[PDB]
Amino acid sequence: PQITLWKRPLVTIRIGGQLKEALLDTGADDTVLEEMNLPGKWKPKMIGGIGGFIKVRQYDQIPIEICGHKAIGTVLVGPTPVNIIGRNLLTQIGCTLNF
Amino acid sequence: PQITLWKRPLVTIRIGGQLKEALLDTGADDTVLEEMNLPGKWKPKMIGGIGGFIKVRQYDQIPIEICGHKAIGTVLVGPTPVNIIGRNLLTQIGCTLNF
Numbered sequence A, B: 001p002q003i004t005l006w007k008r009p010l011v012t013i014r015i016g017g018q019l020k021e022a023l024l025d026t027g028a029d030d031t032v033l034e035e036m037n038l039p040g041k042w043k044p045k046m047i048g049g050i051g052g053f054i055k056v057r058q059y060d061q062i063p064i065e066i067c068g069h070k071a072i073g074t075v076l077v078g079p080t081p082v083n084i085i086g087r088n089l090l091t092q093i094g095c096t097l098n099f
């Protein structure tokens, strides 16, 4: 699809058995999801945004479907106010910016 | 142009007559530039991101040329970690997400 930017580019994602709304975020290197109790091993990480850093749990090779397109990769889980789909998955679903 | 996302979508902008590098950021509602001087009146504002809130200076109706495309709009200036072109100006230059 084509998504204009008059409003936040929120889409439905499917991850770890849940449907969520997530922001397609070209400014995010990584994918950062709101707190969710995913199974499996993880590694601690700190990621920085406007306002400072938050602590997240890094889960690898997690399947995630974004607006009907399958992806698989690293997802960071922590106290973000918004689910953020970053470039690591945007590239996998063939997403580009166009103007 | 069409911009893919395997690298950060950084572009050159021209603002107050100066060249800068900025990130095309669909996750950003507003445009936020690193500390700099701009002409004219500004008002204090606060904005929030992944790591909390920051204080910025709101400049209205500021011309910026983004990768060769003209915009004139609100520019926030403050301790953002990176220069960010947000949706308020991405819409002005006709930027969409496509996959």
Ligand SMILES: O=C(N[C@@H](Cc1ccccc1)[C@H](O)CN(CCCc1ccccc1)S(=O)(=O)c1ccc2ncsc2c1)c1cccc(O)c1
Binding pocket: A023, A025, A026, A027, A028, A029, A030, A031, A032, A047, A048, A049, A050, A080, A081, A082, A084, A086, B025, B026, B027, B028, B029, B030, B031, B032, B047, B048, B049, B050, B051, B080, B081, B082, B084, B086
């Ligand atoms: O930060 C904003 N928006 C962010 C997403 C958001 C939206 C709503 C609520 C919370 C967050 C960004 O789109 C993603 N972040 C990095 C991008 C900027 C930037 C880039 C680099 C450093 C600092 C800021 S970010 O969320 O901080 C982010 C995302 C993924 C990621 N992976 C590794 S570091 C990292 C940082 C934002 C911008 C303007 C106004 C505003 O009110 C909020």
